[PDB]
Structure formats: structure tokens, C-alpha cells
């Protein structure tokens, strides 16, 4: 199906502690592949996934060069932000950035992303047309005028349409066996009485990839939306994901409830009934 690549980066200033911490991570779909940590001894871009280590040291030499340059830019951006918002050097501030691309199943470019957040709020973002900027406040509007005059968007479009898409296609083929795999959820139900008259039914989905999944409880076919307790999908740590969903039912009525599991690794949706 469709695929995506994303690079995330965070810069956190620590004024009395020395220079800001910079951490970047890359991802293909839900799989992390690279990382760089400015406080780490290595001072290199490091592999986090099996299929990326086969790259030669010229790849790594170039990638840690570009990520090191990014940490310097976002460091100066943190100081420019202090001026724009007229903030004191006492405080710690955060600059986040995301960029990357989506491709279809034929590998064609669909979408591209280049965007920033300051102290957890949108700062400036490149629009889907990849020619225009969305500035979130008056401070960001200064950056927008500056980048409009310098034609920053055209550079990013070239990267996002060319280099980003080619990288993504390559990783997808080199990592074909892990990245184009689909692991269906392993499912089961637990049942705990909570009183004389009531019991909890919990529906589990384990070991699935990718993370996207839907768990739904029905009673006699009627969706239980408002009465379903649902946990955020969570990593198991081995590269797969977990989720569960629970309802409180009257004792003896368990057989009226069905849990429905939809995942792209299942031939057809699963229905579970206690």
C-alpha cells in the first residue's frame, strides 16, 4: 500500500547546563531506522534497524554531516525565537521539526512535509502545495517573509520530490522482508467479575504490524462506543504493537457482546465472543 518516511528532531535549550540537546530519529512507516544524539559519545548517525547497516560509510559520513548541520541550525533558531518572542535566557525552550514524504503503492510521490513547532505549538509549516508557508503567529510571519524572499520552498520541494522519495523507495526494497511484511493481530478475551451482577470483558490484540488497528465492541450488533474503555496503541518493544478494549456487562449476558478486530494483516475482520 502507501508508505511514508519521517525524520523527527527535538532541540531543548538548557541555559545553565551548556548547549542545547539535539536528538533526531528517522522512520519508515512505523519502523525506526536511524538516530543521532548530540550528547552521545559517537557523534554519528547510528543504525537502529537491520536493513540500514548495509549502507557504506559514505552514506553514514554524509548523513551525520547533514544531521550535524541541522543541530547547528536549530540551535541558532532557538536563539532567534527568544528574540522574536522577547523571552529571557533563563528559560528552557523546545524546537521540534518534522519532514518527510509519502508515496503510493506504485511508489509515486503523494505528499511532503517540512514543519516546525516551538514550545509545543505550531510555528511555521510548508503547505501541501510545497510552495507556500503557514505561519502560526506574528513571530512566525517574520520567518515566512524571510523564507519567501529567499525561495526556501523550492529547495525543499526538490529534496522532498527527489531525494526523499528515492531514499524511501530504496529502504522499502532493501528492507522488503521486515518493512513490507504484515503481521496480523493475535487476539483473545479475558473475563473478570467485578461484582454480583457485573463483569469486565477485555478484548486483546497482540503482536501486530503496522500500528493501525481498530477494536470495537458491540452488543447485539449495536456499537458500544461511549461505553468502551480503550487504551492507546502501544509498542511491545520487539517491533510489533498491542491494543485492548473493554466493556462492563451484566453477568449472564456475556454472549450478547462481540469484539470486532480490523487490521490490514487479516484476510477478513475477526469477531470474538466470550
Amino acid at each position: 500500500g502507501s508508505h511514508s518516511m519521517r525524520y523527527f528532531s527535538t532541540s531543548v535549550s538548557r541555559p545553565g547546563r551548556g548547549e542545547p540537546r539535539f536528538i533526531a530519529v528517522g522512520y519508515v512507516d512505523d519502523t525506526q531506522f536511524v538516530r543521532f544524539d548530540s550528547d552521545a559519545a559517537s557523534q554519528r548517525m547510528e543504525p537502529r534497524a537491520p536493513w540500514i547497516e548495509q549502507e557504506g560509510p559514505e552514506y553514514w559520513d554524509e548523513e551525520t554531516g547533514k544531521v550535524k548541520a541541522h543541530s547547528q541550525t536549530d540551535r541558532e533558531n532557538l536563539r532567534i525565537a527568544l528574540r522574536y518572542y522577547n523571552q529571557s535566557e533563563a528559560g528552557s525552550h523546545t524546537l521540534q521539526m518534522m519532514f518527510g514524504c509519502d508515496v503510493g503503492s506504485d511508489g509515486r510521490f503523494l505528499r511532503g512535509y517540512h514543519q516546525y513547532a516551538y514550545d509545543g505549538k505550531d510555528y511555521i509549516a510548508l503547505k501541501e502545495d510545497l510552495r507556500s508557508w503557514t505561519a502560526a503567529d506574528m513571530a512566525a510571519q517574520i520567518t515566512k517573509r524571510k523564507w519567501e524572499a529567499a525561495h526556501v520552498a523550492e529547495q525543499q520541494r526538490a529534496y522532498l520530490e527527489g531525494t526523499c522519495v528515492d531514499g524511501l523507495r530504496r529502504y522499502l526494497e532493501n528492507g522488503k522482508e521486515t518493512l513490507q511484511r504484515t503481521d496480523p493481530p493475535k487476539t483473545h478475551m479475558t473475563h473478570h467479575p467485578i461484582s454480583d451482577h457485573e463483569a469486565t470483558l477485555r478484548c486483546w490484540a497482540l503482536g501486530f504490524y503496522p500500528a493501525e488497528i481498530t477494536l470495537t465492541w458491540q452488543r447485539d450488533g449495536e456499537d458500544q462506543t461511549q461505553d468502551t474503555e480503550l487504551v492507546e496503541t502501544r509498542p511491545a518493544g520487539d517491533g510489533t504493537f498491542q491494543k485492548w478494549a473493554a466493556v462492563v456487562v451484566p453477568s449472564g449476558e456475556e454472549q450478547r457482546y462481540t469484539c470486532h478486530v480490523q487490521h490490514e494483516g487479516l484476510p477478513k475482520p475477526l469477531t470474538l465472543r466470550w
Binding site: 541541522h70 522574536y84 529567499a150
Partner: peptide, 5 residues
């Protein structure tokens, strides 16, 4: 594959 404010 991996100007200021």
C-alpha cells in the same frame, strides 16, 4: 536520506 528563522 536526510537557512534560519
Amino acid at each position: 536520506l536526510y537557512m534560519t528563522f
